[PDB]
Amino acid sequence: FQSMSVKGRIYSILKQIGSGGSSKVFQVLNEKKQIYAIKYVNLEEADNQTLDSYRNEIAYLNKLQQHSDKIIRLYDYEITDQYIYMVMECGNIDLNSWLKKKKSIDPWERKSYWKNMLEAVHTIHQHGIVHSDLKPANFLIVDGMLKLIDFGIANVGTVNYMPPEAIKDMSKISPKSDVWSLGCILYYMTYGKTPFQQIINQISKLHAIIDPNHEIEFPDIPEKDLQDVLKCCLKRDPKQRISIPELLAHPYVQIQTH
Numbered sequence: 001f002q003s004m005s006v007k008g009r010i011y012s013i014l015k016q017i018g019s020g021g022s023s024k025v026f027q028v029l030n031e032k033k034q035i036y037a038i039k040y041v042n043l044e045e046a047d048n049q050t051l052d053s054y055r056n057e058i059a060y061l062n063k064l065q066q067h068s069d070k071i072i073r074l075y076d077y078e079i080t081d082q083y084i085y086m087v088m089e090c091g092n093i094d095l096n097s098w099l100k101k102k103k104s105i106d107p108w109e110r111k112s113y114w115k116n117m118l119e120a121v122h123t124i125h126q127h128g129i130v131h132s133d134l135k136p137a138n139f140l141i142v143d144g145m146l147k148l149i150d151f152g153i154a155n156v157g158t159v160n161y162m163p164p165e166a167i168k169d170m171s172k173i174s175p176k177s178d179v180w181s182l183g184c185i186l187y188y189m190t191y192g193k194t195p196f197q198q199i200i201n202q203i204s205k206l207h208a209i210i211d212p213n214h215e216i217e218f219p220d221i222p223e224k225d226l227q228d229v230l231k232c233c234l235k236r237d238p239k240q241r242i243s244i245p246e247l248l249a250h251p252y253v254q255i256q257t258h
Protein backbone atom coordinates (compact mmCIF):
# COMPACT_ATOMS: atom_id res chain seq x y z
CA PHE A 1 0.00 0.00 0.00
CA GLN A 2 2.31 2.77 -1.41
CA SER A 3 2.00 6.62 -1.63
CA MET A 4 3.69 9.59 -3.54
CA SER A 5 4.18 13.38 -3.43
CA VAL A 6 3.78 15.61 -6.51
CA LYS A 7 4.33 19.35 -5.93
CA GLY A 8 3.58 19.08 -2.19
CA ARG A 9 0.30 17.16 -2.53
CA ILE A 10 0.24 13.48 -1.56
CA TYR A 11 -1.40 10.79 -3.67
CA SER A 12 -2.14 7.23 -2.60
CA ILE A 13 -1.61 4.50 -5.19
CA LEU A 14 -4.40 2.04 -5.93
CA LYS A 15 -3.08 0.17 -8.95
CA GLN A 16 -0.75 0.21 -11.95
CA ILE A 17 -2.32 0.49 -15.43
CA GLY A 18 0.74 1.26 -17.55
CA SER A 19 4.06 -0.39 -18.16
CA GLY A 20 6.69 1.45 -20.13
CA GLY A 21 10.34 0.69 -20.73
CA SER A 22 10.95 3.69 -18.54
CA SER A 23 7.37 4.66 -17.65
CA LYS A 24 4.52 3.54 -15.47
CA VAL A 25 0.91 4.70 -15.03
CA PHE A 26 -0.68 4.60 -11.58
CA GLN A 27 -4.30 4.95 -10.58
CA VAL A 28 -4.15 7.27 -7.58
CA LEU A 29 -6.39 9.08 -5.13
CA ASN A 30 -5.85 12.53 -3.68
CA GLU A 31 -6.49 13.70 -0.13
CA LYS A 32 -10.17 14.41 -0.86
CA LYS A 33 -10.49 10.95 -2.45
CA GLN A 34 -10.57 12.13 -6.06
CA ILE A 35 -9.23 9.78 -8.72
CA TYR A 36 -6.30 10.63 -11.01
CA ALA A 37 -3.70 8.93 -13.19
CA ILE A 38 -0.03 9.64 -12.46
CA LYS A 39 2.53 8.95 -15.23
CA TYR A 40 5.94 8.23 -13.75
CA VAL A 41 8.76 8.60 -16.34
CA ASN A 42 12.22 7.40 -15.16
CA LEU A 43 14.97 9.69 -16.50
CA GLU A 44 17.96 7.96 -14.93
CA GLU A 45 19.05 6.66 -18.30
CA ALA A 46 18.08 9.08 -21.06
CA ASP A 47 20.01 11.20 -23.58
CA ASN A 48 19.59 14.89 -24.32
CA GLN A 49 17.54 14.38 -27.46
CA THR A 50 15.12 12.22 -25.50
CA LEU A 51 14.86 14.69 -22.63
CA ASP A 52 14.22 17.68 -24.80
CA SER A 53 11.41 15.70 -26.46
CA TYR A 54 9.69 15.02 -23.12
CA ARG A 55 10.17 18.72 -22.21
CA ASN A 56 8.50 19.66 -25.50
CA GLU A 57 5.69 17.13 -25.21
CA ILE A 58 4.91 18.47 -21.74
CA ALA A 59 5.02 22.11 -22.86
CA TYR A 60 2.55 21.44 -25.66
CA LEU A 61 0.36 19.37 -23.37
CA ASN A 62 0.17 22.36 -21.03
CA LYS A 63 -0.42 24.95 -23.84
CA LEU A 64 -3.25 23.07 -25.66
CA GLN A 65 -5.25 22.43 -22.39
CA GLN A 66 -7.21 25.65 -22.86
CA HIS A 67 -7.87 25.02 -26.54
CA SER A 68 -9.79 21.73 -26.24
CA ASP A 69 -11.52 19.32 -23.85
CA LYS A 70 -10.74 16.44 -26.27
CA ILE A 71 -7.15 16.52 -25.01
CA ILE A 72 -6.22 14.81 -21.76
CA ARG A 73 -5.95 17.06 -18.70
CA LEU A 74 -2.58 17.86 -17.15
CA TYR A 75 -3.30 19.18 -13.67
CA ASP A 76 0.29 19.22 -12.40
CA TYR A 77 3.82 17.85 -12.83
CA GLU A 78 7.19 17.47 -11.08
CA ILE A 79 10.33 17.32 -13.22
CA THR A 80 13.86 16.48 -12.14
CA ASP A 81 16.92 14.98 -13.79
CA GLN A 82 15.88 11.66 -12.24
CA TYR A 83 12.14 11.49 -12.93
CA ILE A 84 8.91 13.02 -14.18
CA TYR A 85 5.57 12.81 -12.36
CA MET A 86 2.44 13.84 -14.22
CA VAL A 87 -0.94 14.19 -12.54
CA MET A 88 -3.48 13.62 -15.30
CA GLU A 89 -7.16 12.74 -15.59
CA CYS A 90 -8.21 9.11 -15.19
CA GLY A 91 -9.96 7.21 -17.99
CA ASN A 92 -12.10 4.08 -18.16
CA ILE A 93 -10.18 2.24 -20.95
CA ASP A 94 -7.90 3.14 -23.91
CA LEU A 95 -9.59 2.85 -27.36
CA ASN A 96 -7.35 -0.14 -28.48
CA SER A 97 -8.31 -2.32 -25.48
CA TRP A 98 -11.98 -1.32 -26.05
CA LEU A 99 -11.92 -2.32 -29.80
CA LYS A 100 -10.32 -5.72 -28.96
CA LYS A 101 -13.19 -6.41 -26.45
CA LYS A 102 -16.26 -4.71 -28.09
CA LYS A 103 -17.32 -6.98 -31.02
CA SER A 104 -20.19 -4.91 -32.59
CA ILE A 105 -19.73 -1.08 -32.44
CA ASP A 106 -22.92 1.11 -32.33
CA PRO A 107 -23.14 3.52 -35.36
CA TRP A 108 -23.95 6.52 -33.07
CA GLU A 109 -20.98 5.65 -30.78
CA ARG A 110 -18.62 5.31 -33.79
CA LYS A 111 -19.70 8.75 -35.16
CA SER A 112 -19.40 10.37 -31.71
CA TYR A 113 -15.85 8.94 -31.21
CA TRP A 114 -14.84 10.05 -34.74
CA LYS A 115 -15.90 13.66 -34.10
CA ASN A 116 -13.79 13.55 -30.95
CA MET A 117 -10.68 12.29 -32.76
CA LEU A 118 -11.12 15.04 -35.37
CA GLU A 119 -11.50 17.89 -32.78
CA ALA A 120 -8.32 16.77 -30.86
CA VAL A 121 -6.11 16.17 -33.95
CA HIS A 122 -7.38 19.36 -35.54
CA THR A 123 -6.34 21.33 -32.46
CA ILE A 124 -2.76 20.05 -32.56
CA HIS A 125 -2.45 20.83 -36.27
CA GLN A 126 -3.49 24.40 -35.58
CA HIS A 127 -0.41 24.60 -33.39
CA GLY A 128 1.73 22.99 -36.09
CA ILE A 129 2.00 19.51 -34.62
CA VAL A 130 1.59 16.32 -36.63
CA HIS A 131 1.31 13.13 -34.59
CA SER A 132 2.60 10.95 -37.43
CA ASP A 133 1.91 7.90 -35.26
CA LEU A 134 -1.84 7.86 -34.64
CA LYS A 135 -3.37 4.66 -33.30
CA PRO A 136 -6.21 3.61 -31.01
CA ALA A 137 -3.83 3.46 -28.04
CA ASN A 138 -3.34 7.23 -28.26
CA PHE A 139 -7.03 7.79 -27.38
CA LEU A 140 -8.55 7.31 -23.89
CA ILE A 141 -12.27 6.93 -23.11
CA VAL A 142 -13.20 9.38 -20.38
CA ASP A 143 -16.82 9.96 -19.36
CA GLY A 144 -17.97 8.28 -22.57
CA MET A 145 -15.75 10.69 -24.46
CA LEU A 146 -12.56 10.24 -26.45
CA LYS A 147 -9.48 12.19 -25.42
CA LEU A 148 -6.00 12.29 -27.09
CA ILE A 149 -3.39 11.30 -24.50
CA ASP A 150 -0.15 12.13 -26.48
CA PHE A 151 1.17 14.21 -29.43
CA GLY A 152 3.89 11.91 -30.80
CA ILE A 153 6.73 14.24 -29.81
CA ALA A 154 8.02 12.01 -27.02
CA ASN A 155 9.02 8.34 -27.44
CA VAL A 156 4.65 -5.07 -30.09
CA GLY A 157 4.04 -1.99 -32.30
CA THR A 158 2.18 -2.10 -35.66
CA VAL A 159 2.56 -0.73 -39.26
CA ASN A 160 -1.29 -1.02 -39.86
CA TYR A 161 -1.87 2.76 -39.49
CA MET A 162 1.23 3.88 -41.50
CA PRO A 163 0.53 6.23 -44.50
CA PRO A 164 2.02 5.41 -47.97
CA GLU A 165 4.01 8.70 -48.06
CA ALA A 166 6.04 7.65 -44.96
CA ILE A 167 7.23 4.44 -46.70
CA LYS A 168 7.86 6.05 -50.10
CA ASP A 169 9.80 8.78 -48.31
CA MET A 170 12.61 6.34 -47.46
CA SER A 171 9.94 16.57 -44.75
CA LYS A 172 7.42 14.54 -46.75
CA ILE A 173 5.11 14.49 -43.73
CA SER A 174 2.07 16.74 -43.49
CA PRO A 175 -1.30 17.05 -41.54
CA LYS A 176 -2.75 14.63 -44.21
CA SER A 177 -0.54 11.82 -42.76
CA ASP A 178 -2.71 11.96 -39.60
CA VAL A 179 -5.88 11.81 -41.82
CA TRP A 180 -4.73 8.37 -43.24
CA SER A 181 -4.15 6.94 -39.69
CA LEU A 182 -7.53 8.34 -38.47
CA GLY A 183 -9.06 6.70 -41.59
CA CYS A 184 -7.42 3.34 -40.61
CA ILE A 185 -8.91 3.64 -37.01
CA LEU A 186 -12.38 4.44 -38.50
CA TYR A 187 -12.09 1.58 -41.07
CA TYR A 188 -11.29 -0.70 -38.08
CA MET A 189 -14.30 0.72 -36.13
CA THR A 190 -16.42 0.04 -39.30
CA TYR A 191 -15.22 -3.32 -40.79
CA GLY A 192 -13.61 -4.83 -37.62
CA LYS A 193 -10.10 -4.91 -39.17
CA THR A 194 -7.44 -2.44 -40.48
CA PRO A 195 -7.29 -1.94 -44.34
CA PHE A 196 -4.17 -4.14 -44.72
CA GLN A 197 -4.65 -6.36 -41.55
CA GLN A 198 -4.91 -9.61 -43.65
CA ILE A 199 -1.26 -9.36 -44.96
CA ILE A 200 1.01 -11.40 -42.58
CA ASN A 201 4.41 -10.79 -44.33
CA GLN A 202 5.38 -7.36 -42.89
CA ILE A 203 7.43 -6.54 -46.04
CA SER A 204 4.39 -7.44 -48.25
CA LYS A 205 2.14 -5.14 -46.08
CA LEU A 206 4.48 -2.15 -46.70
CA HIS A 207 4.35 -2.89 -50.43
CA ALA A 208 0.54 -3.15 -50.42
CA ILE A 209 0.07 0.22 -48.69
CA ILE A 210 2.37 1.88 -51.22
CA ASP A 211 0.95 0.02 -54.22
CA PRO A 212 -1.44 1.99 -56.43
CA ASN A 213 -2.60 -1.23 -58.09
CA HIS A 214 -3.68 -2.79 -54.82
CA GLU A 215 -7.33 -1.87 -54.28
CA ILE A 216 -8.56 -1.31 -50.68
CA GLU A 217 -11.97 -3.03 -50.31
CA PHE A 218 -14.95 -0.90 -49.13
CA PRO A 219 -17.82 -3.43 -48.57
CA ASP A 220 -21.37 -2.03 -49.04
CA ILE A 221 -22.70 -0.70 -45.69
CA PRO A 222 -26.06 1.02 -44.68
CA GLU A 223 -24.23 4.28 -43.76
CA LYS A 224 -23.42 5.66 -47.23
CA ASP A 225 -21.74 8.77 -45.71
CA LEU A 226 -19.34 6.64 -43.66
CA GLN A 227 -18.26 4.77 -46.83
CA ASP A 228 -17.38 8.14 -48.48
CA VAL A 229 -15.39 9.28 -45.42
CA LEU A 230 -13.26 6.05 -45.55
CA LYS A 231 -12.71 6.20 -49.33
CA CYS A 232 -11.63 9.92 -48.95
CA CYS A 233 -9.24 9.37 -45.95
CA LEU A 234 -7.62 6.26 -47.52
CA LYS A 235 -6.63 7.99 -50.86
CA ARG A 236 -2.86 7.22 -51.48
CA ASP A 237 -2.08 10.73 -52.93
CA PRO A 238 -1.87 13.03 -49.82
CA LYS A 239 -2.64 15.98 -52.20
CA GLN A 240 -5.92 14.14 -53.20
CA ARG A 241 -6.60 12.91 -49.58
CA ILE A 242 -9.32 14.92 -47.69
CA SER A 243 -8.33 17.51 -45.05
CA ILE A 244 -9.38 17.71 -41.41
CA PRO A 245 -11.18 21.01 -42.02
CA GLU A 246 -13.13 19.45 -44.91
CA LEU A 247 -13.86 16.35 -42.84
CA LEU A 248 -15.46 18.53 -40.19
CA ALA A 249 -17.96 19.78 -42.79
CA HIS A 250 -18.64 16.30 -44.18
CA PRO A 251 -22.19 15.00 -43.93
CA TYR A 252 -21.06 12.06 -41.80
CA VAL A 253 -20.30 14.28 -38.81
CA GLN A 254 -22.60 17.26 -39.47
CA ILE A 255 -25.78 15.43 -40.54
CA GLN A 256 -28.01 13.71 -38.00
CA THR A 257 -29.64 10.33 -38.61
CA HIS A 258 -27.92 10.21 -41.99
Ligand SMILES: Cc1ccc(-n2nc(C(C)(C)C)cc2NC(N)=O)cc1
Pocket residue numbers: 017018025037038039072088089090091092093094137140149
Ligand atom coordinates in the same frame (compact mmCIF):
# COMPACT_ATOMS: atom_id res chain seq x y z
C1 LIG B 1 -2.46 0.54 -22.67
C2 LIG B 1 -2.73 1.79 -21.91
C3 LIG B 1 -2.73 1.76 -20.53
C4 LIG B 1 -2.96 2.92 -19.80
C5 LIG B 1 -3.19 4.10 -20.49
N1 LIG B 1 -3.40 5.30 -19.75
N2 LIG B 1 -2.56 6.36 -19.87
C6 LIG B 1 -3.06 7.31 -19.05
C7 LIG B 1 -2.44 8.66 -18.90
C8 LIG B 1 -3.50 9.72 -18.66
C9 LIG B 1 -1.48 8.64 -17.71
C10 LIG B 1 -1.67 8.98 -20.18
C11 LIG B 1 -4.24 6.86 -18.39
C12 LIG B 1 -4.45 5.56 -18.85
N3 LIG B 1 -5.44 4.62 -18.57
C13 LIG B 1 -6.56 4.95 -17.80
N4 LIG B 1 -7.47 3.93 -17.59
O1 LIG B 1 -6.75 6.05 -17.32
C14 LIG B 1 -3.21 4.14 -21.88
C15 LIG B 1 -2.98 2.98 -22.58
